[PDB]
Amino acid sequence: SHMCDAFVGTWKLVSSENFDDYMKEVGVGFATRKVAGMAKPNMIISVNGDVITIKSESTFKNTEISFILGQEFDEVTADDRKVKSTITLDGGVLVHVQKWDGKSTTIKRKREDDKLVVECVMKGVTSTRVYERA
């Protein structure tokens, strides 16, 4: 009955490219990058009314955000940055912008064939992470 229906469900990580470089660009330190790079998270996406919830579950750490499209919220990220986030839908793509200390990074999620493709961009550096249904 809505746009976001194509995203809903439980997803598992199947491939990752350039994720160590993207994390260096964001400022993540060595030990966190090593543990993050080894993670094989599940991503669980659900909708209730106007509220969308995205859960990332892994061996080390579970994180979860709930939000309304276009309404800014405060978020603590898995590497413990405190950021201001806004998530919108742009032409069928979920676009998550995070701002902290004069910096910005964007995470886009798109459905492509049977995959949910996550593209993370900071300055010049892009990491692509591909998920399939669990």
Ligand SMILES: O=C(O)C1=C(C(=O)Nc2sc3c(c2-c2nc(C4CC4)no2)CCCC3)CCOC1
């Ligand atoms: O869900 C995804 O595929 C995305 C990300 C992701 O899985 N990150 C994980 S899983 C995870 C950890 C981290 C982590 N990210 C960071 C910085 C880069 C943001 N520091 O630690 C650390 C603890 C163990 C499990 C991040 C980028 O956006 C999409």
